[PDB]
Amino acid sequence: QTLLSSFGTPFERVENALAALREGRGVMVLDDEDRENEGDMIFPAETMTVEQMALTIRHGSGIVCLCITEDRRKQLDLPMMVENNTSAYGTGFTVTIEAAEGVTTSVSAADRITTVRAAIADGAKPSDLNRPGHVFPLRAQAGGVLTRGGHTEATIDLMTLAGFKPAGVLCELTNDDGTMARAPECIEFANKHNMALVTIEDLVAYRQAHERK
Amino acid sequence: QTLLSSFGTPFERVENALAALREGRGVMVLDDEDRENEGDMIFPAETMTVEQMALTIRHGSGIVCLCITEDRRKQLDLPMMVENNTSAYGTGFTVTIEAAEGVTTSVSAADRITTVRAAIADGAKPSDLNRPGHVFPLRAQAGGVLTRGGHTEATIDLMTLAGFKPAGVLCELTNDDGTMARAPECIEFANKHNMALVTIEDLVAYRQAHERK
């Protein structure tokens, strides 16, 4: 029927993504069903393993981001990277971070996981993170995808709907030749690694219908 | 004789690295000859091709950095990322950058090359770059490795000794399993891709001897 119809109806695709996150698997997030659009891999920040971080560095851009809420950004006392944000999407990059303890060169998969876990910990303090670093936090807008339909918001919204703390790891899927993976390559990669697939349009509609009354 | 003795004497290793950069090949930079140390791949910012950027994303951390001088940082009007730098090495990260024209999702190898080329162009202006972005500039300390023996300084020093503008691209070599490549893996990767190998200690000594009188 549609490009993603084999993964369920729009609302089924959301629920399947939630089930995947709860089961320790990844999720592939697309903007819509345009076959020329690209996709991001996402994992819950709480449960992401070193192997999953290794997979993300190996097949992603390597610019592995930590989506967090505004209250977490305030708890970590992380300034936004630029006051006058001139990026095309208004991406909410904060200052970059490194775990203050337990890392060496900080770019290994284990070291980035150590940094992610320090940032999202219950009781995390600003002194638990050095700046700058090699993990890139992204601050989601209040309201999630109902305010801004970005991957940052979609990531957070999916984590809370799955029952996790509002924090997720994301990275863009990259072909081995340096080009970015478009929708058919994203679908094949997700089938190969047992990841669910959902669009941001699916999630917007899901949240609008479920939060009404 | 030594771990790197097959690549020439210390001073020969520098000259071989210069020849490699002039010939359009990469260079593997190590700190010293400790077999447990890690290494970075570097290319001249002027001549780095999309294929070389693809190789860097595929086998590196994906955190692909642009080493620049202070005068270039002033020409681009790029603030340092943090005022109070608390990283272990005092890494000179500026605000991150994106070409203001000619990119889409900005993480593809072609798009990062477009961003690098906009930053290093003769006559580059601050409005040629949006901030934040997906290329990470590094500001070398004045004096190069004679002031600070970091990979940022070594990169710049190698480019100027090779006859290029003082700007180079660097990234840490990553194993496929997520661990960082130590010296034997760096040597094999360099032999496989016809890259020269040099240490920062070689380069410090080279510059001290050649700049005396």
Summarize the structure.
Chains A, B: Homodimer. The structure is a homodimer of 213-residue chains. Chain A is α/β, with parallel strands linked by helices.
Walk me through this protein's architecture:
Two copies of one chain form a homodimer. Chain A has 213 residues and is of the alpha/beta class. Chain A has one domain (1-213). Chain A is built from seven helices and seven strands, in the order H-E-E-H-E-H-E-H-E-H-E-H-E-H. The first copy, chain A, has helices spanning 10-22, 50-59, 70-76, 109-120, 151-162, 183-192, 200-211; strands spanning 27-30, 39-44, 65-68, 97-99, 129-139, 168-172, 196-199. Chain A has a seven-stranded mixed β-sheet with strand order 4-5-3-6-2-1-7. The longest helix of chain A has 13 residues, at 10-22. Chain A is globular. The first copy, chain A, starts with 9 loop residues before the first helix and ends with a helix. The A-B interface holds A 38, 50-51, 53-54, 57-58, 60-64, 81-82, 84-88, 91, 93, 95-96, 98, 100, 105, 107-110, 130-134, 172, 174, 176-180 and B 38, 50-51, 53-54, 57-58, 60-64, 81-82, 84-88, 91, 93, 95-96, 98, 100, 105, 107-110, 130-134, 172, 174, 176-180. Chains A, B: One of its GO terms (cellular component) is cytosol. Chains A, B: Pfam families: DHBP_synthase.
C-alpha Rg of chain A, in Å? 16 Å
Spatial order of strands in the largest sheet of chain A: 4-5-3-6-2-1-7
Please work out how many helical segments of chain A DSSP would assign. 7
The run of helices and strands of chain A is: HEEHEHEHEHEHEH
**Cα end-to-end separation of chain A:** 32 Å
Largest interface: A-B, 42 and 42 residues
Which sheet architecture does the biggest sheet of chain A show? 7 strands, mixed
Total beta strands of chain A: 7
What portion of the residues of chain A fall into strands of 2 or more residues? 15-25%
Q: What's the number of domains of chain A?
A: 1
Helix content of chain A: 25-40%
PDB class: isomerase
Keywords: RibB, G108S, isomerase
Assembly: dimeric
Entry title: The crystal structure of 3,4-dihydroxy-2-butanone 4-phosphate synthase mutant (G108S) from E. Coli
